[PDB]
Amino acid sequence: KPDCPLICTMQYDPVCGSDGITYGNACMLLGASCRSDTPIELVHKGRC
């Protein structure tokens, strides 16, 4: 599973991550995959 970032931004860059969720940003995901529930990933850089 990926890792976590170091505070990306608030430039709403909603990306659909392999799990079924649109994260505020692919960065906010690294934080998720790091402490969400399972090994998440990225599929589309937008609203799916």
UniProtKB/Swiss-Prot annotation:
The residue ranges of the Kazal-like domain are 1-48
Q: Per its UniProt record, what PROSITE patterns does this chain match?
A: KAZAL_2
Keyword line: Disulfide bond, Protease inhibitor, Serine protease inhibitor
GO biological process terms held by the UniProt record: cell differentiation
Marked site, Reactive bond, at M10, Q11
The UniProt entry, under Gene3D superfamilies, shows:
3.30.60.30
User: Which residues pair up as cystines?
Assistant: C4-C34, C8-C27, C16-C48
A GO CC annotation given for this chain? extracellular region
GO MF, one example: serine-type endopeptidase inhibitor activity
**One matching Pfam family, short form?**
Kazal_1
Which superkingdom is the protein from?
Answer: Eukaryota
Q: What does this protein do?
A: Exhibits strong inhibition toward Streptomyces griseus protease B (SGPB) (AC P00777).
PANTHER family per the UniProt record, alphabetical: FOLLISTATIN, ISOFORM A-RELATED, FOLLISTATIN-RELATED
Protein name according to UniProt: PI-actitoxin-Avd5a
